[PDB]
Amino acid sequence: SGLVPGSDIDATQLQGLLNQELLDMFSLDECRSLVALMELKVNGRLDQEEFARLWKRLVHYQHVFQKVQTSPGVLLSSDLWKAIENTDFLRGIFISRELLHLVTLRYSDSVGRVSFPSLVCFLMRLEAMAKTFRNLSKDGKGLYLTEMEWMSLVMYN
Amino acid sequence: SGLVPGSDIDATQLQGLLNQELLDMFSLDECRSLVALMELKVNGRLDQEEFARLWKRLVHYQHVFQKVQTSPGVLLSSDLWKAIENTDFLRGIFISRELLHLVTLRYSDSVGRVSFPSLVCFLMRLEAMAKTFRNLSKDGKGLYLTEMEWMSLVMYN
Ligand SMILES: [Ca+2]
Ligand SMILES: [Ca+2]
């Protein structure tokens, strides 16, 4: 259990596992986002391959949070740039100062702390969204999307 | 309090308010999404105008959930189409069968129920994302975005 030997794990199961193993808790909604970001065969659950992908990232994020935190479980908003730098999955991704500011507002609590579940969500989403662009763009400058393409990319994540 | 008379409400305050007034609870992360979707002056809090915008929607969603639910607090996944139909803010938005399927996977729990906080998130996000497209598209068929435009739209929400 929480090993995914040819079996699957859904968001509800994933939540119980992450909260028991890693921990500020992961919400069920966040786990549904994690499933959405990591699915290859889209069916609302993670097979062994998809789970391995998620797990490798989670292990990595644990290390990054441990390295960057000011104290056990406390990562400061002003150190979020260091979390990005320490996340190899983001290689080649450069965000603007303004975008960093927006993500800081979105992922940090009211006293300038970023929880582990919040950091996980942010780093996985940043990677997914940056890779979508880089992979779909024909010139690396812009992206053209159909309505249906746009809506699917922005709604299932 | 929870009235926002020239004052502001942040996501943490918003969470306490929504959970006390409406309720399955809103997570803090969901409240940060709600703030992001409703901001006009982007600073991580809702001023009186932004809060009014959020509140009008929330009142509407309450009515829709009450109308469509199978029993107190139980909205079935298979009835999500009826929630969309009953939400005037979505007027002019048509989603595909496939997109409906994806959102069902993303917003429903493991037994085919959609919680009130999940419905709120879904209906607000659908509206925001559809309006972005409709408003940015020059022909109503496609959208061209710069990298920076793409990343900002997909990360702050
Ligand atoms: Ca799958
Ligand atoms: Ca504001």
Swiss-Prot record, chains A, B:
Tissue and organ distribution: Weakly expressed in lung and testis. Weakly or not expressed in other tissues.
GO biological process entries: proteolysis
Coiled-coil annotated residue ranges, if any: none
Entry keyword annotation includes Repeat: yes
Location of the EF-hand domain: 26-61, 124-157
Keywords: Hydrolase, Protease, Repeat, Thiol protease
Single GO term (MF): calcium-dependent cysteine-type endopeptidase activity
Keyword Hydrolase on entry: yes
Gene Ontology cellular component list: cytoplasm
Superkingdom of the organism of origin: Eukaryota
Family the entry assigns: Belongs to the peptidase C2 family.
Function: Probable non-lysosomal thiol-protease.
Name used for this protein in its record: Calpain-13
Residues of the whole record sequence present: 515 to 669 of 669
